[PDB]
């Protein structure tokens, strides 16, 4: 009957799903929609059916971190999701360019997790569906919201120690735009499961300058509003695209 | 100023913390206590002050999976936690011996995560603290609750695919007792940060037999009760041992 | 001072470059163009300035294999190249769907090389530029040439042995579309060097069926013609997009 | 047939076994016992039956290094040993706290070998039996011998070069107490073969300070005596527990 | 009928083969032989039958880089080659000792490729055949050409970046003599296929000093002539030693 | 003062050293010599000064296994050894060809240890000195003792479990000849410390057929004698060169 961790049935899963880390953000999103229906809330996983621009799609929280989000993503992908967009927060790895409150839309990720490696060899790319990427970009443009594009570092380590150096500076040099914790895992599971994925992120600080105070847990309100509008617009567009085809 | 994810202050961190994966379990635990004070609930991290046998210790949810729980464990360990017990659920890797509803107290874990390896070389052991392990066993004995002891596989993969073999059969052959998702990460962070750690776990099925229906999300009620009484008793003892 | 292997000057590098494995193919491609100027031919590296649709871009061969093509790509990327499209041949990993003579436009690749790992950690993705991918797709559509899209396995091993199993079946299960030898190396070097990359590939057989005679390195004529038309259209278009 | 390297029979293997690296230490241990029976001495592997406090248990040398000790431990574990305590020497990784002559009882180890990795994936822990650990600690207490506790780094490299940096400072930062060469291997083999293991070690120097002469393989004699008494007492105690239960 | 990349038949393969990176070099070697017969040229793989001192052996180019040369080497080893000598160019990893133009004959190599690892575990050595090494050395002394001997680093990376350190300095400290791109791949494939291998290399610069001019794409002409004389003489001796 | 583990002084170390695993073999060897002087016996490390064919060289035991032998080898290489030959026992990886009692002379090895990896990256070859190899082979030929040549797998695992597959069958398919536990470690330390190394090994069984009784660690006496004569002759011949 009910999925094991989402506690919703196969029949409640829609072709398009918006995922977010923070079950709090699901509440912020659902009020922006035309209407919504709360489906379930188990553990970190809160599921709401959204109605927006004539379309029906779930918004589901995935929790912090790749192993816990993989549980969510597998239950979605194995039970009928066709398109999953992650809308999340991130740190800037290009502090001269990308600042707090800026928005980045990402087409690929660094697999600095474990779960993707337990599913497929490390040489395999974490890459999004490029039409989902294009839809996110197009929606930002339609909405007159400037955005960055680039690779996300998805790292399982949020707090580094002083023993093993963090790879973040290496990846900055390699031109990764941003760092968060879940996108690579989504992308790999999606590819493996024939599910189209993408990622849009809001910057909350720069991990190179956390000792300087370059962090705020409270996201820039109008920029957060803009990201949700872009993410919802893209989900509705991909839902109408899916429904036609 | 509050911890970034826990959203409690450093002053609110007690020497002993009981951690669980499911925020819903915090409510089940806190009502077993003599009294409790709700502190915060942010993301999947719910924090309550428990009072039990005259002692005071936090109960905090850490969510599913090693990277998410590491955020919780670092915030506790960097801000004054001295002892942390994980009370969680697990699958049996020894189905002939360890059955649904049984309880395992674990002394060490397999580091099938990523974050511990981002903190220290993979050769380093995920090992719990002796006194914690011993207190858990002694409490089970006093409560007359049979338990197993053994190594946990802490794996970031809950749902395997058909491409890369799961290592679970290998580790069963190596005499690992159970599997869950967080314990190795706790142990390694605790060793690195000089925090004493331990784990007690309730069996909810067997991953080798999920296709036969050997799984139930609803934990055997009396055994969950016993596990909680053991964990709370050990937390209270360790809180007085710490004073001492 | 000439580039060490290409034997052309920095001054001769154009923003857009079309790369191919076979120096013989550079000569097939140039005659399709409006006009051309031969620049150099050293080792496997043949360089020709192409004129097409009022645009100017190099076509340069890179030889067989990741280490040799990296020398080519580094010399291009460090001396003024801004967009590099690889037009190559490949095997199908999905023989029921993708057949000899079909064309695949690839957005990402498996890094089964060494040189990319000597440049950046394994976890980093081999991923192409969206604009380049989109332009290649749009030109195929404008020419009414059907194409597949997907991930290529870029493997340094063409001939497997009987000791260490090939990962090709694993990657087929993982939904990789095709296999060749250079594309992951191109994509990683491009990302590190801020150069936009992409790949278009023609199927010459299926490695799973070589023992059945499912192979022919005489590429299907009208299909090779189609792929060259799309690649040249995309280069010309991207040359003007760069100018803007 | 005799065991290939120990050259004793399966029938001579006792439930409890004390192992040491140095065959010479088997000579210092045995004369401490009530009585002993010299069994065999083949290659670096010297085996004696010890009789101490009413109990009977082998003492066996395992040689220097993880691959050589694995041969010994496999022959013991595959032929009836149920408890193996290693009593060894080690270097300090915490020179401000742990000094030459001090004794450390360890309950897990860093797997800086190869043979354990040829037997099980690297993520698997090298961990001791915590009853064995507790018995060693309790014996140290009864004898009024202060001890340290913590993780040993078990490294196959004794003499580092200037090319690949040693991981020893890393592991010092990670709170590993001491370094030696065999304990991880014993622990992993014991876990795989259902044999309870533990480790007690005497400090002979600090590897960070070898260039300053912080080393002497002449072990502090009164502390070596103490370590032997703790190890023998723990073996005898575990032997009785074994016999009562079995 | 024809090998996929070399486009020669099995019947055209001689027991001894000289391999070189550059197809241009096959043309330069062949004209130096007593006579020759061009066989094939496809992609970067050019195949010519050489006749020298009464013996015959192919000279075949393998291209730049391990994956490209493995295609060539597999085709030779699986179709009847019995002895393969690589003659090539290299950088010095010992610049106080081994200079531009110097000649190094190598008995083993560092496996800094991927293809050898896709064939056999990384712990397996890249090692050449003794007789081949000894024959090379003996021809060198015969012709009174000083040579060095040691290990080559065969690295898939010619141009390092500033993110992941090159291991070349480590391998210099480890006493590797020189660096090039193909020899370890030849050695491993040879061992796996029961084919006897070896390497002779001429130094064209030092990768530690490229940023100060220690490089020249013109190989010292007379030292190069000497290297090739050594290589051809050895191929002839081995074609008889094999015989 | 004394070497930590060998318990001899640097002054006692000769240019050429013969190493064996078993201290009992040192006692066996020394009595074949013209004369000897017992120097030290500490732990597994027994040191004797041998006098054979007018030459002087140590014979020292290194114990079982790579980590223990590395301690012996570093002490030798860091205090004056120039040439080290290992004379050991091994299992056959090619049981149709190489049988109990056969002798193999080896010139490279699989690095299935840890200590070599803690000293240099895994891609680096474990390779013997080719002059030492040649000296061993020539000594065998002139004593009319047939020998095999090839790669040894040096594996830290003697007793495999049923969880992780042994790589031995893979290495047999890769044409490795025999398996033992120390040679790769010797070769790597020697290359790093500029010491010339080599290995001669007598087969005591086949690990693929241990469950059929294909083992006896009583080495074939006449064959052990032959190996010792070969190793001793090579040590002397190499010792005349030091100067
Ligand atoms: O800076 C960060 N690092 C990792 N994850 C994040 N999510 C928001 N900011 C960050
Ligand atoms: O079977 C399991 N596997 C991983 N985590 C778990 N938590 C409860 N059961 C399990
Ligand atoms: O099948 C193939 N495998 C690898 N490279 C290729 N290039 C064309 N076809 C192939
Ligand atoms: O300092 C040491 N290092 C490694 N092993 C040891 N055994 C005793 N001391 C040491
Ligand atoms: O310096 C070099 N590095 C790599 N390959 C080479 N081939 C000639 N010189 C070199
Ligand atoms: O069969 C063997 N395996 C490993 N080491 C050995 N030493 C002698 N025989 C063997
Ligand atoms: O605060 C950490 C969280 O924000 C972004 C990141 O991906 C993680 O879930
Ligand atoms: O259902 C999975 C959860 O239960 C136990 C495991 O550790 C994880 O948090
Ligand atoms: O035949 C192998 C060649 O064709 C395509 C492949 O990428 C390589 O260059
Ligand atoms: O000298 C080093 C030896 O002593 C302790 C170490 O474990 C090794 O056996
Ligand atoms: O310059 C690069 C080429 O020369 C030697 C090297 O092996 C490569 O093939
Ligand atoms: O019996 C094992 C011993 O013999 C040869 C091997 O290398 C080891 O020292
Ligand atoms: Na989580
Ligand atoms: Na050419
Ligand atoms: Na090439
Ligand atoms: Na891109
Ligand atoms: Na030993």
Residue numbers in the entry:
A (entry chain B): 3 to 247
B (entry chain A), C (entry chain D): 3 to 246
D (entry chain C): 3 to 248
E (entry chain F), F (entry chain E): 3 to 245
From the paper:
Purine nucleoside phosphorylase (PNP) is central to purine salvage mechanisms in Plasmodium parasites, the causative agents of malaria. Purine nucleoside phosphorylase (PNP) in Plasmodium forms a key enzyme in the recycling of predominantly host-derived purines, catalysing the phosphorolysis of inosine to produce the major purine precursor for the salvage pathway, hypoxanthine, and ribose-1-phosphate. Crystal structures and sequence homology studies have distinguished two broad families of PNP enzymes: those that form trimers (such as the mammalian PNPs, Type 2) and those that are hexameric (such as E.coli PNP (EcPNP), Type 1). Crystallographic studies of PfPNP have shown it forms a hexameric assembly suggesting its closer alignment with the Type 1 PNP group, although functionally it has been noted that, unlike other hexameric PNPs, adenosine is not a substrate for PfPNP.
The asymmetric unit consists of one hexamer of PfPNP in which there are six very similar, but not identical, subunits. In accordance with the shapes, sizes and positions of electron density observed within the active site, the products hypoxanthine base, ribose sugar and arsenate anion (AsO4) – formed from the irreversible arsenolysis of inosine followed by hydrolysis of the ribose-1-arsenate – were modelled in to the observed electron density map. In all subunits, the arsenate moiety is stabilised mainly by two arginine side chains (Arg 88 and Arg 45' of the neighbouring subunit) and further hydrogen bonds are formed with donors from the hydroxyl group of Ser 91 and the backbone amino groups of Gly 23 and Ser 91. However the participation of the Arg 27 residue in the anion binding pocket, where its guanidinium side chain forms charged hydrogen bonds with the arsenate molecule, has not been observed in structures with sulphate bound. In the PfPNP-HRA complex, in five of the subunits the Arg 27 side chain points toward the active site ('closed' conformation, average torsion angle χ1 = 163° and χ2 = 175°) and forms hydrogen bonds with oxygen atoms of the arsenate ion. By contrast, in chain F this arginine is in an 'open' conformation with its side chain pointing away from the active site (torsion angle χ1 = 178° and χ2 = 75°) and hence does not interact with the arsenate ion. Similar to the PfPNP-Imm complex, the carboxylate group of the Asp 206 side chain interacts directly with N7 of the hypoxanthine, and has been proposed to be the general acid/base for protonation of N7 of the substrate in the transition state. In the PfPNP-HRA complex, although all active sites are occupied, in four subunits (A,B,D,E) the active site loop is ordered – indicative of a catalytically-active form – whereas its disorder in subunits C and F may reflect the start of a transition in which the enzyme adopts a 'relaxed state' to release the products of arsenolysis. At this point the C1' atom lies equidistant between the N9 of the base and the incoming phosphate/arsenate oxygen nucleophile.
